[PDB]
């Protein structure tokens with residue numbers, strides 16, 4: 001089952017990367033090539049009918 | 056040669072944006088569309104030995120780095136730039152960084168500039184007192200005194216002559232007085248004294264702040280509070296003092312309330328505009344604090360210990376003389392820190 | 398097995414736009430994103446718990 | 458005192474002292490940890506009010 | 519080795535040594551990063567400027583010595599550093615600015631997004647004088663009921679009826695909703711205008727983009743006037 | 750948390766163990782205590798309430814609104830000194 005094989009290879013590589021350093025959400029789980037994203041939306045997007053009425 | 060390394064990251068960065076974009080797409084879909092169909096598949100599916108591996112590997116991987124973890128703890132330049140796609144044109148921020156790259160390398164090609172006066176260099180690259188000439192003083196405008204109509208005849212001995220309705224200060228004497236004043240600043244700095252630079256004319260702050268910084272001294276650019284020295288306990292007692300070693304590093308020792316209320320008197324006062332700071336000069340006299348000041352043709356020489364005859368109205372002349380005194384202090388400070396090392 | 402099928406489904410949706418980095422590179426990129434969404438949930442819960450106790454015992 | 462209790466809870470939460478129940482209950486943990494270093498020997502006498510006479514006016518007529 | 523006591527701040531002999539030192543620190547940053555461009559969203563009037571209050575800055579900026587113009591000077595430099603383009607900003611600037619942000623992180627907001635209920639109804643309450651009104655707005659065809667009675671029966675004055683219709687007339691949705699209004703207390707005018715206020719607050723859920731138009735018409739403002747005991 | 754009698758019997762006085770046992774049989778272990786933000790019943794500090802403080806508690810034997818002694822069983826017969834001196838340093 002390559003699906004379970006590649007998933008189980010991806011889960012253990014992640015374990016090693018997080019193990020290398022103290023696991024902190026902001027730092028360890030940052031976007032690729034990013035120092036860290038802070039653990040800090042409900043700005044609903046108007047529907048096409050809502051926006052048409054406003055226009 | 057190594058560009059591929061960066062390309063490998065960008066690939067992941069692009070993939071990450073794709074994963075996030077479609078994570079938000081599924082956040083809008085109602086659960087009734089996905090959940091029941093998803094559960095039904097599992098009801099119609101049978102787990103295999105391998106499938107179970109991830110059934111518990113992910114449970115722990117999510118029960119270790121998501122639930123049982125510490126949410127908190129008890130590219131270096133411009134790291135927040137959002138690069139644009141290789142097909143899209145440069146963003147406004149990228150154009151700024153693209154221009155900065157040009158400014159460092161190309162923008163200065165073709166010629167060098169010599170024998171041109173740059174105002175900022177008077178503050179940041181002051182000359183040493185021994186290298187000062189009459190030409191340099193004259194280039195700074197130090198010789199331009201006040202109108203002959205405003206003459207304070209007590210300055211007669213500093214005057215070289217009158218020209219174009221103003222008195223010309225004798226720069227030969229200015230140089231000798233400046234060298235003497237500079238040596239005093241160097242001595243006090245090398246001895247560890249408190250040097251205060253006072254100047255309240257518009258524009259002097261920049262020169263005053265740098266002079267204090269390079270001599271480890273103090274400055275006042277806004278207003279001299281009458282009584283700062285004679286009534287120091289009612290004005291300056293509340294402000295914080297600190298103990299320092301011979302290297303001017305804070306010892307960190309907490310100070311007894313007795314030591315924090317005692318008057319802290321300057322060892323030397325430098326006044327850029329003495330005609331507007333009579334209060335400070337009289338307090339210095341009352342407090343036996345030696346003083347240095349630029350003495351223009353309408354200014355009283357005897358009110359200061361070490362007068363420097365010179366134009367006090369031009370920022371260039373003032374910053375030129377202040378720069379020389381500030382560097383003299385710096386050399387004294389460097390000689391004191393050097394004798395401590397060896 | 399929603400633990401697995403939901404993550405497989407997520408890649409299926411991304412597969413729509415895709416219409417083998419996806420074997421190990423994308424798979425990892427997804428697990429990490431989920432962990433950052435499960436850590437923000439836990440951060441929000443702490444704020445609720447702290448706002449429902451008496452953070453200010455003596456004056457406020 | 459207010460910053461000593463907030464720190465106590467922040468630490469008792471960051472150390473984890475049912476995920477579904479982790480969205481309803483607000484019980485932070487052991488009473489001792491929440492009130493660590495807050496005893497009768499240092500809290501009561503420091504918060505008591507009206508403890509110092511600072512003014513007095515005596516009139517006759 | 520020999521130790522001596524010296525003033526802590528370079529501005530010790532100034533009128534307000536604490537404020538001048540803080541200004542100097544910000545001025546250094548504005549000099550070191552003079553080239554960095556400023557936000558072009560400033561024209562878009564980004565709604566972010568949570569700086570500490572004058573009284574809060576007086577704890578760190580000289581206390582009684584602190585003058586209002588000195589606080590104004592601090593804000594002009596805090597905003598200028600804050601308005602540097604977010605992409606091109608650095609840690610140094612943000613570190614310095616963090617100490618001046620009003621502390622509101624330990625606490626959270628008390629507002630939860632309003633949504634239609636299980637039957638598609640928007641429920642809002644309004645008050646005028648001594649009257650109160652609870653309205654149920656749902657999408658419909660312009661049917662209105664006041665306390666179970668026809669509008670013309672309950673409200674005899676046409677001006678009271680026109681007041682109830684005004685919020686729907688602003689969003690041009692008079693024939694798009696069914697209103698079930700319940701009112702109690704005060705008299706006809708208080709109840710009619712309390713219903714008016716409650717309909718306006720209930721219409722914002724159907725389209726939050728029309729709140730600005732409702733506010734501009736004046737139907738979302740609670741009328742404060744009440745009978746005052748003569749003093 | 751519910752503790753075994755052994756542990757509780759090494760820290761609390763015997764007279765108070767029966768109350769602790771009855772409370773551990775009436776309050777279920779899975780009780781989710783809530784914090785009141787209207788009425789503050791407990792003090793702002795932690796206290797087991799096992800010892801009578803000479804100052805912060807009512808003086809034993811003194812008459813007061815919540816005195817539990819009978820009116821003929823008070824033990825304050827001298828009134829020339831302040832009954833409750835200030836706590837700590839004094």
Ligand SMILES: [Mg+2]
Nearest residue numbers: 201351367368
């Ligand atoms: Mg002059």
